[PDB]
């Protein structure tokens, strides 16, 4: 019974910070106390003092030790603070030992839970960034030998056979300040609107960095006691949806690149419907007989966009959408991330051509939509997405001509700023641009759509004079104060964009309305 034992030396898991060094996941030093029952059995009159110092009931504590009198090792308590373990060891109770351990702590908790994820009881990454970069972050535990006698009392630390190796630091692209702002405002809007879920993505249009990514519902990764599966989802990355009218700027980009359309062109949209075979295209706004190109986007005419689509054909539309990354692998490798679906057909009937152009029959993620709007904002130059801090600006791919992008930027500025436009999306002190959308949710137990359940969207970027930031707001089943994208999601865009631009010290380009 007198032999040497090898015990592990816990390795320090790598620090996860935001883009500026703000800790997001940190391995904190804790103290675990263990006992040698055989030794404690000789110090019985120290039990009541020891039990009390452990916050345990004298008798229940005594039952524990007695039931284990045979054993040489049992945990007393795990994960005390260093000073708490210091106090109990200082009592000098025979057979009580301490070992230094680590506990993974998440300082911003629920604010960044979906992005960062968490580690399991073996601090192996199980969700999110903790999972995706587990190899980078994980340390290598060491090993050492201890000598124990017949009764199991430790008499000597013999040697370290293997040093512990710490994991590596990882800096995310996220700006925690923006993440806090986005988290709070999304939560507020979810609650004001009695919505079921939501996502908000902010992107640096020049660098491809994800500055903020938040979802509702969320959870506290430091306390997962009553955690339900639904709250764990990074919906921005892993859930798909039909983008609806938020793809209209890309259909318009195809129209302009085709050589067949120009901004002054007028389209007749009377009577606000278009019959094609059995299916009917319907406009919601029906207070105009004709619209120029800009007014098609301002009023969000499905009939208008459909007529342009029939003229240019589906292939030109499919092509811009593929080019801006809709339904395409993002290359981020976030666990569970979806590619979505951009349908490719042998032949395109009018029906499928029209619905593609106004954003149904395809499915995207909120990250993809934001990336697509970044391309438009960045003068038609698409840059790869990143969830880690970028050192040097990546090489972009010119996916939309600068000229077309410039015109479409102007139209989207008009969608926000012009009379009859989405005025709730106006950003104090700035010129913003963007597009609202409203989509019926898909039926649960059949094909087709729900009658009274909706997804509210707004996508945009700012400032219009030199776009820095793109943002997408998606809100599921608002039920208390309307459901249109320009009612529900646009105000979120306004407030978050305002705070974001200020936090990033972007100078106001609209002083007639500044703060
Ligand atoms: C409410 C609008 C002004 S309509 C138009 C457009 C774009 O998103 N959205 C729609 O046309 C949407 N259609 C829709 O969900 N589906 C599913 C199958 N095909 C079809 O039409 C809709 C929205 C509200 C009530 C009824 C229908 N933009 C909205 C905006 O800007 O908020
Ligand atoms: Cl319904």
UniProtKB/TrEMBL annotation:
Pathway: Cell wall biogenesis; peptidoglycan biosynthesis. The keyword Cell wall biogenesis/degradation applies. It comes from the Bacteria. Its EC number is 3.4.16.4. Residues 9-157 form the Penicillin-binding protein dimerisation domain. Residues 198-497 form the Penicillin-binding protein transpeptidase domain. The active site is at 245 (acyl-ester intermediate). It is found in: Cell inner membrane. GO terms for molecular function: penicillin binding; peptidoglycan glycosyltransferase activity; serine-type D-Ala-D-Ala carboxypeptidase activity. Keywords: Carboxypeptidase, Cell cycle, Cell division, Cell inner membrane, Cell membrane, Cell shape, Cell wall biogenesis/degradation, Glycosyltransferase, Hydrolase, Membrane, Peptidoglycan synthesis, Protease, Septation, Transferase, Transmembrane, Transmembrane helix. GO terms for cellular component: plasma membrane. InterPro entries: Beta-lactam/transpept, Beta-lactam/transpept-like, FtsI_transpept, PBP_dimer, PBP_dimer_sf, PCN-bd_Tpept. Coiled coil: none annotated. Pfam families: PBP_dimer, Transpeptidase. Belongs to the transpeptidase family. FtsI subfamily. Catalyzes cross-linking of the peptidoglycan cell wall at the division septum. This is Peptidoglycan D,D-transpeptidase FtsI. It comes from Pseudomonas aeruginosa.
């Amino acid at each position: 019974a007198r032999s040497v034992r090898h015990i592990a030396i816990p390795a320090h898991r790598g620090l996860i910070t935001d883009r500026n060094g703000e800790p997001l996941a940190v391995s904190t030093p804790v103290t675990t106390l263990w006992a040698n029952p055989k030794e404690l059995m000789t110090a019985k009159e120290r039990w009541p003092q020891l039990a009390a110092a452990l916050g345990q009931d004298t008798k229940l504590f005594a039952d524990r030790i007695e039931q284990n009198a045979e054993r040489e090792f049992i945990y007393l308590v795990r994960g005390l603070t260093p000073e708490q373990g210091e106090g109990v060891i200082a009592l000098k109770v025979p057979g009580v030992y301490s070992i230094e351990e680590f506990r993974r702590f998440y300082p911003a908790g629920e604010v960044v839970a979906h992005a960062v994820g968490f580690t399991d009881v073996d601090d192996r990454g199980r969700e999110g960034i903790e999972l995706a970069f587990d190899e980078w972050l994980a340390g290598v535990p060491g090993k050492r030998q201890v000598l124990k006698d017949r009764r199991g009392r430790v008499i000597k630390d013999v040697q370290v056979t293997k040093n512990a190796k710490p994991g590596k630091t990882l800096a995310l692209s996220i700006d925690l300040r923006l993440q806090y702002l986005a988290h709070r405002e999304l939560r507020n809007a979810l609650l004001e609107n009695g919505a079921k879920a939501g996502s908000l993505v902010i992107m640096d249009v020049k660098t491809g960095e994800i500055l903020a990514m938040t979802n509702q519902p969320t959870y506290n990764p430091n306390n997962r006691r009553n955690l339900q599966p639904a709250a764990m989802r990074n919906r921005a990355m892993i859930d798909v949806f039909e983008p609806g009218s938020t793809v209209k700027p890309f259909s318009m980009s195809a129209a302009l690149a085709s050589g067949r359309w120009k901004p002054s062109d007028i389209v007749d949209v009377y009577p606000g419907t278009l019959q094609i075979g059995r299916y009917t295209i319907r406009d919601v706004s029906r207070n105009s007989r004709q619209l120029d190109l800009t007014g098609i986007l301002i009023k969000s005419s499905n009939v208008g966009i459909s007529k342009i689509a029939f003229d240019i054909g589906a292939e030109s539309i499919y092509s811009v959408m593929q080019q801006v990354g809709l339904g395409q692998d993002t290359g981020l490798g976030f666990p569970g991330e979806r590619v979505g679906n951009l349908p490719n057909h042998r032949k395109w009937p009018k029906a499928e051509t029209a619905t593609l152009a106004y954003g149904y029959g395809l499915s995207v993620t909120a990250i993809q939509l934001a990336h697509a709007y970044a391309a438009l904002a960045n003068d038609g130059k698409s840059v790869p997405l990143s969830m880690t801090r970028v050192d040097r600006v990546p090489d972009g791919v010119q996916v939309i001509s600068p000229e077309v992008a410039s015109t479409v930027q102007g139209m989207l500025q008009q969608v926000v700023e012009a009379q009859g436009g989405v005025f709730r999306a106006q950003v104090p002190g700035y010129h913003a641009a963007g597009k609202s959308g409203t989509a019926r949710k898909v039926s649960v137990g059949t094909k087709g759509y729900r009658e009274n359940a909706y997804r509210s969207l707004f996508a945009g970027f700012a400032p219009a004079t030199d776009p820095r930031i793109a943002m997408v707001v998606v809100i599921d089943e608002p039920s208390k104060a309307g459901y249109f994208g320009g009612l529900v999601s646009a105000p979120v865009f306004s407030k978050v964009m305002a705070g974001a631009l200020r936090l990033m010290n972007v100078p106001p380009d609209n002083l007639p309305t500044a703060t």
